[PDB]
Design an enzyme around this catalytic site. Sequence first.
Site, PDB file in Angstrom:
ATOM      1  N   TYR A  38       0.850  -0.966  -0.221  1.00 34.31           N
ATOM      2  CA  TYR A  38      -0.030  -0.094   0.172  1.00 34.31           C
ATOM      3  C   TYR A  38       0.836   1.048   0.411  1.00 34.31           C
ATOM      4  O   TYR A  38       2.264   1.322   0.515  1.00 34.31           O
ATOM      5  CB  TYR A  38      -1.010   0.135   1.303  1.00 34.31           C
ATOM      6  CG  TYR A  38      -2.156  -1.010   1.200  1.00 34.31           C
ATOM      7  CD1 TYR A  38      -2.661  -0.753   0.809  1.00 34.31           C
ATOM      8  CD2 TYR A  38      -1.270  -2.071   2.430  1.00 34.31           C
ATOM      9  CE1 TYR A  38      -4.108  -2.621   0.878  1.00 34.31           C
ATOM     10  CE2 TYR A  38      -2.674  -2.834   2.432  1.00 34.31           C
ATOM     11  CZ  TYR A  38      -4.386  -2.442   1.330  1.00 34.31           C
ATOM     12  OH  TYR A  38      -4.980  -3.836   1.538  1.00 34.31           O
ATOM     13  N   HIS A  40      -1.847   0.987  -3.463  1.00 37.18           N
ATOM     14  CA  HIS A  40      -1.827   0.586  -4.945  1.00 37.18           C
ATOM     15  C   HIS A  40      -3.453   1.333  -5.619  1.00 37.18           C
ATOM     16  O   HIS A  40      -3.825   1.345  -4.757  1.00 37.18           O
ATOM     17  CB  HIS A  40      -1.248  -0.430  -5.162  1.00 37.18           C
ATOM     18  CG  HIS A  40      -2.122  -1.695  -4.089  1.00 37.18           C
ATOM     19  ND1 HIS A  40      -2.037  -2.581  -2.922  1.00 37.18           N
ATOM     20  CD2 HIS A  40      -3.218  -2.194  -3.490  1.00 37.18           C
ATOM     21  CE1 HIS A  40      -3.051  -2.281  -2.051  1.00 37.18           C
ATOM     22  NE2 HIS A  40      -4.125  -2.482  -2.829  1.00 37.18           N
ATOM     23  N   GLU A  58      -5.930   2.947  -3.324  1.00 39.80           N
ATOM     24  CA  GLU A  58      -6.504   2.846  -2.021  1.00 39.80           C
ATOM     25  C   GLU A  58      -5.818   3.197  -0.887  1.00 39.80           C
ATOM     26  O   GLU A  58      -4.271   2.481  -1.439  1.00 39.80           O
ATOM     27  CB  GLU A  58      -7.001   1.384  -2.100  1.00 39.80           C
ATOM     28  CG  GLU A  58      -6.124   0.380  -2.638  1.00 39.80           C
ATOM     29  CD  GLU A  58      -7.019  -1.410  -2.247  1.00 39.80           C
ATOM     30  OE1 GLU A  58      -7.256  -1.240  -0.651  1.00 39.80           O
ATOM     31  OE2 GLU A  58      -7.824  -1.641  -3.480  1.00 39.80           O
ATOM     32  N   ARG A  77     -10.883   1.395   3.687  1.00 42.26           N
ATOM     33  CA  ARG A  77      -9.596   2.052   2.945  1.00 42.26           C
ATOM     34  C   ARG A  77     -10.170   3.652   2.396  1.00 42.26           C
ATOM     35  O   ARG A  77     -11.457   3.863   2.523  1.00 42.26           O
ATOM     36  CB  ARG A  77      -9.487   1.598   1.769  1.00 42.26           C
ATOM     37  CG  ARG A  77      -9.073  -0.556   1.907  1.00 42.26           C
ATOM     38  CD  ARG A  77      -7.983  -0.594   1.674  1.00 42.26           C
ATOM     39  NE  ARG A  77      -7.796  -1.631   1.702  1.00 42.26           N
ATOM     40  CZ  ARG A  77      -7.888  -2.925   2.967  1.00 42.26           C
ATOM     41  NH1 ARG A  77      -8.266  -1.992   4.053  1.00 42.26           N
ATOM     42  NH2 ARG A  77      -7.816  -3.450   3.145  1.00 42.26           N
ATOM     43  N   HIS A  92     -14.902  -2.912   2.818  1.00 43.73           N
ATOM     44  CA  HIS A  92     -15.053  -4.070   3.151  1.00 43.73           C
ATOM     45  C   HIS A  92     -16.592  -5.256   3.902  1.00 43.73           C
ATOM     46  O   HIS A  92     -16.842  -6.378   3.451  1.00 43.73           O
ATOM     47  CB  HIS A  92     -13.497  -5.312   3.082  1.00 43.73           C
ATOM     48  CG  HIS A  92     -13.016  -5.590   2.528  1.00 43.73           C
ATOM     49  ND1 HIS A  92     -13.488  -6.166   1.013  1.00 43.73           N
ATOM     50  CD2 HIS A  92     -11.242  -4.606   2.041  1.00 43.73           C
ATOM     51  CE1 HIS A  92     -11.856  -5.969   0.423  1.00 43.73           C
ATOM     52  NE2 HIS A  92     -11.187  -5.872   1.152  1.00 43.73           N
ATOM     53  N   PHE A 100     -16.295  -4.381  -2.134  1.00 39.58           N
ATOM     54  CA  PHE A 100     -16.112  -2.989  -1.399  1.00 39.58           C
ATOM     55  C   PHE A 100     -17.760  -2.658  -1.793  1.00 39.58           C
ATOM     56  O   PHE A 100     -18.628  -2.441  -2.560  1.00 39.58           O
ATOM     57  CB  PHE A 100     -15.070  -1.638  -1.689  1.00 39.58           C
ATOM     58  CG  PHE A 100     -13.853  -2.407  -1.171  1.00 39.58           C
ATOM     59  CD1 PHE A 100     -12.955  -2.187  -0.301  1.00 39.58           C
ATOM     60  CD2 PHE A 100     -13.104  -2.810  -2.620  1.00 39.58           C
ATOM     61  CE1 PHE A 100     -12.048  -2.362   0.033  1.00 39.58           C
ATOM     62  CE2 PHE A 100     -11.494  -3.197  -2.159  1.00 39.58           C
ATOM     63  CZ  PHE A 100     -10.890  -2.408  -0.965  1.00 39.58           C
TER      64      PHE A 100
HETATM   65  N1  LIG Z   1     -12.734  -5.796  -4.779  1.00 39.22           N
HETATM   66  C1  LIG Z   1     -11.727  -4.522  -5.166  1.00 39.22           C
HETATM   67  N2  LIG Z   1     -10.094  -4.888  -5.171  1.00 39.22           N
HETATM   68  C2  LIG Z   1      -9.435  -4.089  -6.181  1.00 39.22           C
HETATM   69  C3  LIG Z   1      -9.826  -3.116  -6.725  1.00 39.22           C
HETATM   70  N3  LIG Z   1      -8.284  -3.082  -7.194  1.00 39.22           N
HETATM   71  C4  LIG Z   1      -7.581  -3.535  -7.058  1.00 39.22           C
HETATM   72  N4  LIG Z   1      -7.856  -4.170  -5.984  1.00 39.22           N
HETATM   73  C5  LIG Z   1      -7.398  -5.926  -5.256  1.00 39.22           C
HETATM   74  O1  LIG Z   1      -7.466  -6.333  -4.828  1.00 39.22           O
HETATM   75  C6  LIG Z   1      -7.871  -6.831  -3.748  1.00 39.22           C
HETATM   76  C7  LIG Z   1      -9.119  -7.569  -2.733  1.00 39.22           C
HETATM   77  O2  LIG Z   1      -9.142  -7.098  -1.964  1.00 39.22           O
HETATM   78  C8  LIG Z   1      -6.845  -6.073  -3.298  1.00 39.22           C
HETATM   79  O3  LIG Z   1      -5.638  -6.311  -2.976  1.00 39.22           O
HETATM   80  P1  LIG Z   1      -4.254  -6.462  -1.992  1.00 39.22           P
HETATM   81  O4  LIG Z   1      -5.081  -8.308  -1.218  1.00 39.22           O
HETATM   82  O5  LIG Z   1      -3.345  -6.615  -2.341  1.00 39.22           O
HETATM   83  O6  LIG Z   1      -4.627  -5.341  -1.230  1.00 39.22           O
HETATM   84  C9  LIG Z   1      -7.372  -4.745  -3.986  1.00 39.22           C
HETATM   85  O7  LIG Z   1      -6.564  -3.609  -3.422  1.00 39.22           O
HETATM   86  C10 LIG Z   1     -11.176  -3.099  -6.784  1.00 39.22           C
HETATM   87  O8  LIG Z   1     -11.683  -2.511  -7.878  1.00 39.22           O
HETATM   88  N5  LIG Z   1     -12.069  -3.731  -5.967  1.00 39.22           N
END
Ligand SMILES: Nc1nc2c(ncn2[C@@H]2O[C@H](CO)[C@@H](OP(=O)(O)O)[C@H]2O)c(=O)[nH]1
EC number: 4.6.1.24
Length: 104
Positions: A38, A40, A58, A77, A92, A100
């Site tokens: 983060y 990202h 985020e 977030r 979440h 989300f």
């Molecule tokens: N649900 C969701 N996840 C996203 C999105 N863009 C990126 N992600 C990433 O996909 C995963 C969903 O929880 C997270 O990664 P991370 O687990 O590496 O932080 C999240 O950061 C989006 O638009 N929606």
Amino acid sequence: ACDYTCGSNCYSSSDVSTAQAAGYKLHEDGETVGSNSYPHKYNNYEGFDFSVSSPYYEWPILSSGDVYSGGSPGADRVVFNENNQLAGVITHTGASGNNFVECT
Ligand SMILES: Nc1nc2c(ncn2[C@@H]2O[C@H](CO)[C@@H](OP(=O)(O)O)[C@H]2O)c(=O)[nH]1
Ligand SMILES: [Ca+2]
């Protein structure tokens, strides 16, 4: 009253500004924190109607009031863009899987 309510978590505008400032600083420097790297890119697969332009990033906002530095990011977030404009506060909590919903 809460400016943003994510499930049971209550945030004020200053809570959000503080978290946002930290996330943007890291973004500017090209650095990340935590195992999920983060801040990202946030793709907005959910299709929220944000008032500001993409790209979006985020960054975790913690109910403890501390600025995220690693470990579990919790469910909340702050989403900001390239110009450090707040796109919204999402969570979440109350959403299936890793999807989300917006904090009210
Ligand atoms: N649900 C969701 N996840 C996203 C999105 N863009 C990126 N992600 C990433 O996909 C995963 C969903 O929880 C997270 O990664 P991370 O687990 O590496 O932080 C999240 O950061 C989006 O638009 N929606
Ligand atoms: Ca607070």
